[PDB]
């Protein structure tokens, strides 16, 4: 499953740093990144854009392979 992760900080890798930075992270729906701890990890689905963090949700252990959430997983779990 896709994990990112991001730290808060006064004063960070931020204000320019190498002036060129081009990147767009995920948004949790569980919270609006006002405390979600010092380091946390948001999980986006591989066939949607389900973007919550695994603690957010509560996710017990990050599955070394394809996320699906329960919308798509329910999706195909019928077809074949
Ligand atoms: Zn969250
Ligand atoms: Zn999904």
Redesign the pocket.
């Known amino acids: 499953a896709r994990t990112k992760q991001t730290a808060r900080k006064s004063t960070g890798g931020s204000s320019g740093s190498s002036q060129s930075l081009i990147d767009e992270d995920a948004v949790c729906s569980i919270c609006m990144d006002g405390e979600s701890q010092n380091s946390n990890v948001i999980l986006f689905?591989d066939?949607?854009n389900?973007a919550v963090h695994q603690e957010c949700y509560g996710v017990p252990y990050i599955p070394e392979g394809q996320w699906?959430?329960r919308?798509?997983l329910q999706s195909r779990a019928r077809p074949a």
């Open positions: 689905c066939m949607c389900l699906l959430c919308h798509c």
